[PDB]
């Protein structure tokens, strides 16, 4: 109960909110893959290797609830 209240306080101290469920990771993994071609050098492989590691988080969320992980990633990315 006090951890719930101390989460409401983390909203009220800074008035933004974002969806759970892995909805944030897949917008970030779009912005990076559109930004990486501007950086151009060997550094381009390190940014795209960052994006693959953030999407690689919500597999650990799907794989954990009994689902088939890869298809239930591909459906979200296509959506």
């Amino acid at each position: 109960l006090r951890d719930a209240l101390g989460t409401v306080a983390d909203v009220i101290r800074d008035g933004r909110a974002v969806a759970g469920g892995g909805a944030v990771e897949i917008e970030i993994a779009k912005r990076l893959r559109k930004y990486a071609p501007q950086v151009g050098g060997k550094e381009q492989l390190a940014i795209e290797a960052y994006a693959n590691a953030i999407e690689g988080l919500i597999m650990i969320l799907a794989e954990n609830a009994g689902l088939d992980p890869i298809d239930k990633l591909m459906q979200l990315r296509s959506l």
Copy 2:
């Protein structure tokens, strides 16, 4: 000399010609990566794994003439 003549005969028997030097591979590796999103299923990973294996040929051409292979691939793809 007869293998040279028997190459001119391979042009004359069918009146098309294409550039050497790895110029064909990098147009094919563009068409495939634009076509793969239409196929959509697990099969999409097999087509993109085909494109990476055709570009992977001209590294064996650059790596062989003493050059640094990766950058001399990236310059061609950007061009």
